[PDB]
Design a protein around this ligand. Sequence first.
Ligand SMILES: CC(C)Cc1ccc([C@@H](C)C(=O)O)cc1
Length: 133
Amino acid sequence: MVDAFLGTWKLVDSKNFDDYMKSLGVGFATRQVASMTKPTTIIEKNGDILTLKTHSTFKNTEISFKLGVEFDETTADDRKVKSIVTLDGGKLVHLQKWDGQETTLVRELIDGKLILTLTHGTAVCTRTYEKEA
Ligand SMILES: CC(C)Cc1ccc([C@@H](C)C(=O)O)cc1
């Protein structure tokens, strides 16, 4: 159930993140900073409002949203996007759209770990998170 996403998650593995960021036009200097920290993601809920916080040395971000209701978002890399978060079976799907393109940030729980798959065209990144106690 949706509740299994709630809590505090720490990055423990990454594949293809530099490649995903390059695919979004993030410059090398910014990619180096973004890749050299293990971020923390906090997923919270109050009524039908979900909040996702990312804490890192690169940027702190916070978004709030209702499932299935489009919202304006300014991403960590300063893209102004049109976003929506949905639940597709066990997948919490964050879609970002801008300028005729899109990216998805998909979260799934596998063996108690939070797997974040970031897709932008042929660039696919896997970020693996573990729950903090
Ligand atoms: C283009 C990038 C900078 C957008 C971005 C993707 C993933 C994260 C968090 C979840 C992360 O896993 O580091 C933060 C920002």
